[PDB]
Design a protein around this nucleic acid. Structure first.
Ligand code: SF4
Ligand code: SF4
Lengths: 188, 595, 70, 263
RNA sequence: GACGACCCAUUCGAACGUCUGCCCUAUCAACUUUCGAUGGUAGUCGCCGUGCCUACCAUGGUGACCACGGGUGACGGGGAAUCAGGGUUCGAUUCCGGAGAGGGAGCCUGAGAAACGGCUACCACAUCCAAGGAAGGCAGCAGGCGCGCAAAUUACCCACUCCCGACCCGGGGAGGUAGUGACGAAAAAUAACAAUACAGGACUCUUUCGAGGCCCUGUAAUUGGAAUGAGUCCACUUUAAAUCCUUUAACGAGGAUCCAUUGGAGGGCAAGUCUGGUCGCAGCAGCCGCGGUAAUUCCAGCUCCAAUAGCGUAUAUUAAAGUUGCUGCAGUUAAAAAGCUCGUAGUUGGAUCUUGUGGAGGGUUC
RNA sequence: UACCUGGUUGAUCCUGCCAGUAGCAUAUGCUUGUCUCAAAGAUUAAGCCAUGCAUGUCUAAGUACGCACGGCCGGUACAGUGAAACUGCGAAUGGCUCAUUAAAUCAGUUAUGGUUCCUUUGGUCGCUACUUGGAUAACUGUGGUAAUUC
């Protein structure tokens, strides 16, 4: 039967062709350990978005200089890399897109920024503060550690207003310990 | 899961041309067991109902389509609504009720009938087979989601609709409830309904008599009358047809079929001969093994559903293999002894009264070779005409006292014993002559746990009639006295209750007087017959005994009812109140045929 | 012997002692041996293996998770 | 099977210029049979619900029309799927406003409000000329209007002006070089320019060359050219952007520079 | 104003015709033809052109540039999977076109049907009967039997999207809502941090020994306080009425539970030349190979490896395959040049027939 | 990401295939906490089907003597709400499946100067008469058949 639904979706990563290559295994584990990730799929996502960026820049570099399509799509791809802080304003040409690395994108995650901005004591503590509703971006409580921070959004990371750090009510442990402590005198 | 068997039931089967390839392709035959038997010039093959497994390999390889699978019933563990106790009976499926039409249930006795009605009425609740922490109206009303029962059960919980049910056993009514003469009916849920039922159920008795005065044929009509005057949205009629006369079964069906119209639900169940196909609009059938489990079919139309039970025995669901049209004395045989030795008990007439009611008997013959059937309507007092014998009332002011010994079985029983029925067998000798009087009756089918040594206070009332018959047959007599012997018996064991008495008495050289409503019992037992006439509860006479062709034609003529019988299945059927068959029969004076 | 064609097959039974579960005149589910119709290893002329017995898996019987219903 | 005419329209099969969403539904309004082709009209329900937003559902459109508020070419229409099209006027006398249907330069109908003295006439393209019984001459327009006794100078492809209270001809523009036109089909849909050459073929299609206000040049089949003014000046008021069709790089630069859309 | 009708023009179409485009097969080479095959003249029939059909006449029409015949687990297209460049395989399936309502045939009504939720008959099934008769078509939505390796509830509503009628009002298993659902896709928990003892390594004082030392690991007898949703459950919000999600009061964590699995550890290919049992047996092993009394490979304990809310196996198919080769293979000896020569179609085919000065944009002439 | 590795020998260099490696879509095994999407009796049998539903419809404006309900009293055609029945329109669209079908269907491209067309929209609508005829349905009344939307 006809229906008002839609069926558009896609995959966001690819698996490596050699399963047990020693040189590949420890390189991926060093990226997991330095950035505080959960699994290999979380690294293979970032390699796939970089590969699609380089595949587009390598096409536009074939066309003549000042071709109408090379002018329009090239200016759009370069603006969009600067907006997330991955590329320097002082560089700004397609030739420098081919010089980017995976560690340029892993540094722009909210989990990395919560640790580097000094709201947390480790890259492993930062993920737990985000996922437990303690942190805020501009006006909004955010709950997703892989959120990518825009260059004007950068100076507006903070604690939540309804949180035991940030100026809110105490948690359920401190409330129970105080209650039963006063009850130690009797009638509580 | 289901058991499966191959069947060779095809016409013009051809061992002469098929090269016997069904025999050669069977794996059970390849492993060296005789599952298929056939050879050239034999007429039709034989196939084992127990060595066979449900694989279906031979069916692909017969040159003609002569062979196919049927399923057989098994203990499937699917769809269990309720279980009776730990390790006991399984109900399986439940039917769906529909408004503004009549649903009829059918099947053998004990198969799960009354427990479905109790669940639908909300007097029981389903438990899904869980014995420990059983469900309560939360998992129930979630187990039913996606079905019509979901939107139904929520209304009986919220009081948006309410239910009422006629008792299975009506002899409890005079003990379970009380009032004066008349008043027990007067104070029910509406007034106007009581005045209109007076045209179609007989209300002459209850304005003169107490409820504990009543006969079983008054109590059935009183149970039907008192349910029709109450307010409900759903009504259930468990056996509206026991202790009830051939004319009165039609009158009872008519006053049930008037309830239907104003968006109300109705469910009915019977073991009948000729009236369920006047009362119902749809049929459901129950199948299984009665001490252990039952299962409910999808619904059928009336004529179709009756044929699936009584002429043929397999439903559209590709299953049952059982009933084989057991609806008549199908063999039509006679081959027994003719003897000129005889003894005589001939007696004079009398006049008598049980109340404000005139009764009389004419003088006549009685003799040692014969069984006498008694014919006449309910309220003709004829249970008291049996009770004269063995001397309990008016022994010698007309009639005569018995020369030695007489044995008696009553139509009303209310038991008073303790511990087991087993000790009551001391009243008879069992080992000296084991069949038919015990092994083909008390122990049939399957030698079941339900009867062997139970208390009569937990025994079923339909099995209590069987053991009460089996006990009273045990003592010596010249005469045996019987009334209502078919009460609460299904069609299989009605013929066994007729066989167990006639096959015994005709070889013992002994007598009986017997009383029945049911046509099949009367036409098989009799060799001479007695007929009553007059006005019920006012003035009635018992006639001199007659030959069967003289007796029953006068009885059917007095009822203004006449019969048809079918050549393909022997089922006896009623003709409607006016018809070409009715006028062609009553101008001829013949009321039954091919006898 | 296969149900849909009535033709005959021989099949291997994996693992130590699994032949004790199989009995006779009952249903098995059978699968390929891993080489697209050719034989495998030291076994001469066997192209198939058993995977299910009477609607229970040989792995669930062998690891003690289930038993044959009787 | 197909045993007669169809009476439904699937939403992915509907004309692209209506801009219907993907996920509310399976069906779209089938335009009522009438003066304009199914591919070339705007159903009245899409104008009231989706463009002007006076109603949130099709039932709120039905109970606007049944109160007799809506006029098309000066006639009251109660049908919610009536096929309005190019050069028609819609009047809503209760709110006090008037509209004309004209193409936006991206090839879709703009909303275009007009003064009540300009709501008194419309422009019509000539489709046919013929002579009936007793020698009486007849004219046919692009919107199915039939006129008796036209001026004998009015020929094929010309534009005529009519007053809506009486339906009679007032004035006309000849098809010839140097006159202003709008493009009503193909890829050049919604552009405006002056006619600069006509190239003709005996059998098959003639081709017209048109010149822009900014000096761009474009061409189309003669069936797509509608004349709107003698020489350089139009006989109707024109919407924002005036048919100039700027490219995606010019459109980016004005959107950044002007800071419009609440920047 | 409403309704109605003959004729033009519109709109929605329908029907017939033009040009170019197709999977395998020669163990299919000749085919069609008053039993209309190709064409001409007059007519009949039809909504209209026409061998559409009839009478008379002529002797034509197609094929190696593959006709005619046979096969197809063949409905066509938009499209889908895989892919350096070139390709190979798939498309019953929500949009568009066609065909059909058990199998064949005939026909009424109407603007429109050779209609099947219309009718008549034969052929195959099959229901009721008082044996005279009467009634039938789920490849609509739910539901059942049979088949098989293989596929969900006989639930609620016209509120939304649209359609039909005489209509602002009635109707809709079209369509919407909830149930089942590890086909498949996106996001993302299962522990964070201090103190203490032992441990690594910088650096300083000192010939060396030893001490001070500051930043990171574990893990045990076991310490300490703080944070939180998974669950339970009141209220608002949600919607036709509800559920779910989001919002918010009250309970909710010390680890021995609020306990992560599926396959492996000789090589290809990440990870034990541990300890007990069996003895060419039981078994393992895609492939090469392990087991015959001191097994790195079987059966088990411990330890370790890989991916992770997922992982293994059977079978079709794309890449790897420059192992079908157009780009781009090979034929002395590994598989393979007709014994030799002529020759029609097909593919391929030698040389030749009007230029430099001047100006613009740009160079130092084109 | 334009890629290879194990296996013919006492050892070497080749030919050549078998086996491994990654994706995709059907079945199947073991395992499972939260949350947003959503395919699903095509493959075999276009095999056979119990029961319920899936197509109807009235305005100020074709025909109102239904005591069916009703008013301030009366028919001045005749009030007013209005079951049933007659008349008009729709039921040829939608939904389901993939059996047949190889110059056929289908796609792009063109043509009716070789045809038909309910409805919508615009033209056109002047070569006993102050109003004719008879006859059916709803309704009332009497029936036939085991049985039907007889
Ligand atoms: S079943 Fe078939 S094959 Fe077997 S004997 Fe009968 S006809 Fe022959
Ligand atoms: S079904 Fe199988 S087992 Fe039964 S008779 Fe046929 S071949 Fe034998």
């Amino acid at each position: 039967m006809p229906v008002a639904r839609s069926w558009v979706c896609r995959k966001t990563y690819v698996t490596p062709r050699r399963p047990f290559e020693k040189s590949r295994l420890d390189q991926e584990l060093k990226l997991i350990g330095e950035y505080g990730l959960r699994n290999k799929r979380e690294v293979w996502r970032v390699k796939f978005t970089l590969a699609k960026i380089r595949k587009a820049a390598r096409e536009l570099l074939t066309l003549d200089e000042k071709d109408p399509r090379r002018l329009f799509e090239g200016n759009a791809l370069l603006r969009r890399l600067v907006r997330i802080g991955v590329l320097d304003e002082g560089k700004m040409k397609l030739d420098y897109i081919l010089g980017l690395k995976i560690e340029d994108f892993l540094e722009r995650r909210l989990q990395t920024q919560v640790f580097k901005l000094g709201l947390a004591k480790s890259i492993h503590h930062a993920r737990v503060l985000i996922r437990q509703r303690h942190i805020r971006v501009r006006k909004q409580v955010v709950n997703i550690p892989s959120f990518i921070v825009r260059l004007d959004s950068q100076k507006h990371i903070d604690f939540s207003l309804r949180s035991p750090y940030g100026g809110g009510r105490p948690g359920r442990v401190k409330r129970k310990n105080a209650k039963k402590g006063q009850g130690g005198a009797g009638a509580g | 899961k289901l058991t499966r068997i191959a069947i060779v039931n095809h016409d013009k089967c051809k061992p002469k041309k098929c090269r016997q390839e069904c025999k050669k392709s069977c794996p059970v035959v390849r492993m060296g067991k005789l599952c298929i038997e056939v050879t050239p010039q034999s007429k039709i093959a034989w196939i084992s109902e127990t060595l066979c497994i449900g694989c279906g390999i031979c069916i692909k390889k017969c040159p003609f389509g002569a062979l196919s699978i049927v399923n057989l019933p098994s203990n499937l563990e699917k769809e269990t609504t309720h279980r009776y106790c730990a390790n006991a009976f399984k109900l399986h499926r439940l039917p769906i009720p529909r408004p503004g039409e009549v649903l009829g249930l059918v099947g053998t006795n004990g198969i799960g009938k009354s427990t479905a009605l109790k669940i639908l009425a909300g007097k029981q609740k389903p438990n899904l087979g869980k014995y420990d922490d059983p469900p309560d109206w939360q998992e129930i009303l979630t187990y039913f989601r996606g079905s019509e029962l979901q939107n139904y059960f929520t209304k009986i919980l919220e009081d948006d609709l309410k239910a009422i049910i006629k008792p299975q056993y009506v002899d409890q009514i005079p003990k379970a409830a009380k009032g004066t003469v008349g008043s027990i009916l007067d104070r029910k849920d509406e007034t106007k309904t009581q005045a209109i039922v007076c045209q179609q159920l007989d209300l002459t008795h209850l304005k003169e008599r107490n409820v504990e005065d009543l006969s079983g044929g008054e109590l059935q009509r009183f149970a039907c009358a008192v349910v029709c005057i109450q307010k409900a949205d759903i009504f259930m009629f468990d056996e509206p047809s026991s202790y009830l006369d051939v004319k009165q079964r039609l009158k009872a069906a008519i006053t049930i079929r008037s309830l239907i119209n104003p968006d109300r639900y109705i469910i009915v169940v019977e073991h009948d001969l000729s009236v369920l196909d006047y009362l119902s609009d749809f049929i459901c059938c129950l199948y299984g093994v009665p001490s252990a489990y039952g299962v409910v079919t999808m619904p059928f139309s009336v004529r179709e559903g009756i044929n699936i039970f009584l002429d043929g025995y397999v439903p559209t669901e590709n299953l049952r293999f059982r009933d084989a049209s057991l609806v008549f004395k199908v063999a039509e045989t006679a081959n027994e002894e003719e003897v000129k030795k005889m003894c005589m008990y001939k007696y004079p007439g009398m006049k008598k009264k049980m109340g404000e009611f005139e009764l009389a008997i004419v003088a006549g013959e009685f003799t040692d070779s014969e069984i006498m059937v008694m014919l006449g309507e309910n309220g003709t007092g004829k249970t008291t005409f049996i009770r004269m014998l063995a001397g309990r009332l008016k022994p010698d002011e007309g009639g005569e006292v018995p020369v030695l010994n007489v044995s008696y079985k009553p139509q009303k029983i209310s038991p008073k014993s303790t511990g087991s029925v087993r000790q009551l067998l001391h009243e008879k000798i069992r080992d000296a002559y084991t069949h038919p009087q015990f092994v083909t009756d008390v122990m049939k089918p399957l030698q079941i746990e339900n009867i062997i040594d139970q208390e009569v206070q937990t025994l079923s009332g339909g099995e209590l009639q069987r053991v009460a018959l089996a006990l009273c047959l045990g003592k010596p007599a010249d005469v045996y006295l019987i009334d209502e012997p078919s009460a609460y018996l299904d069609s299989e064991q009605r013929l066994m209750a007729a066989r167990v008495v006639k096959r015994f008495i005709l070889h013992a050289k002994k007598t009986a007087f017997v009383v029945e409503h049911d046509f099949i019992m009367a036409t098989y037992l009799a060799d001479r017959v007695i007929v009553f006439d007059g006005i019920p509860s006012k003035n009635t006479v018992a006639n001199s005994p007659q030959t069967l062709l003289a007796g029953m034609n006068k009885f059917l003529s007095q009822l203004e009812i006449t019969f048809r019988r079918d050549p393909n299945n022997y089922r006896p059927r009623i003709n409607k109140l006016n018809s070409i068959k009715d006028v062609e029969q009553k101008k001829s004076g013949n009321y039954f045929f091919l006898d | 012997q296969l149900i849909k064609n009535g033709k005959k097959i021989t099949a291997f039974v994996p693992n130590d002692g699994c032949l004790n579960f199989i009995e006779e005149n009952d249903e098995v589910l059978v699968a390929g041996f891993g080489r697209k119709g050719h034989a495998v290893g030291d076994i001469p002329g066997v192209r198939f293996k058993v995977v299910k017995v009477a609607n229970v898996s040989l792995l669930a019987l062998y690891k003690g998770k289930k038993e044959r219903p009787r | 099977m197909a045993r007669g005419p169809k009476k439904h329209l699937k939403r992915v099969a509907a004309p692209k210029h209506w801009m219907l969403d993907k996920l509310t539904s399976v069906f779209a309004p089938r335009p009522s049979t009438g003066p304009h082709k199914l591919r070339e009209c705007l159903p009245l329900i899409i104008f009231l619900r989706n463009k002007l937003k006076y109603a949130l559902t099709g039932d709120e459109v039905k109970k606007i029309c049944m109160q007799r508020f809506i006029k098309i070419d000066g006639k009251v229409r109660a049908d919610i799927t009536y096929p309005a099209g190019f050069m028609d006027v819609i009047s809503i006398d209760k709110t006090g406003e008037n509209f004309r249907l004209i193409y936006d330069t991206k090839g879709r109908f703009a909303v275009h409000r007009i003064t009540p003295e300009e709501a008194k006439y419309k422009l019509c393209k000539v489709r046919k000329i013929f002579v009936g019984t007793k020698g009486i001459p007849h004219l046919v327009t692009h919107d199915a209007r039939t006129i008796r006794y036209p001026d004998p100078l009015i020929k094929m492809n010309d534009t005529i002006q009519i007053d809506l209270e009486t339906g009679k001809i007032t004035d006309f523009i000849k098809f010839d070089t140097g006159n202003l036109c709008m493009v009503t089909g193909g890829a050049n849909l919604g552009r405006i320019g002056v006619i600069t050459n006509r190239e003709r073929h005996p059998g098959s299609f003639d081709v017209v060359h048109v010149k822009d206000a900014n000096g761009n040049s474009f061409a189309t089949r003669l069936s797509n050219i509608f004349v709107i003014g003698k020489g350089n000046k139009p006989w109707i008021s024109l919407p924002r952007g005036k048919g100039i069709r700027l490219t995606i790089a010019e459109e980016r630069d004005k959107r950044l520079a002007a800071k419009q859309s609440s920047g």
